[PDB]
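To assess whether the prediction recovers the assembly geometry, we first specified each molecular entity separately, as shown.
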Amino acid sequence: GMVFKKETEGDVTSVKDAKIAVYSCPFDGMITETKGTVLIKTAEELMNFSKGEENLMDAQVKAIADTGANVVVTGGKVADMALHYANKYNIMLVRLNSKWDLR
Amino acid sequence: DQQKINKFARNTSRITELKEEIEVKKKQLQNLEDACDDIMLADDDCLMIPYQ
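The predicted structure of the complete assembly is given in tokenized form:
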């Protein structure tokens, strides 16, 4: 059966009979640099964008848990805020995947 | 990521907005002041002085 070299992140699937959700990039990771006017005027909207980002990936692992899939395949990188809700939801995660892994 | 240059970008833009507010209030100051001197010079109290 299918052998994936990529390191298993989070706990194991809830069932071995799980529905396999294969996604190109559901989870992200944030870093930025100087803008059109360099280094934007506040850090409050940086905190305001960071709060909805966690509740976004909270609901992403939740809606996969609601729809029946107990494993998510991430061709993009793993978010930290996505990760600690995925452990409680008992859904297995792949940290990263290449072009051949998804196809 | 730097939050002090986030304060530095906000600081220089607050320098710009203040100086422009001074200039528009100086021109309104001279506009009223030179409006005082012209109307006094022509025709003081003879019968009545209408004011808008």
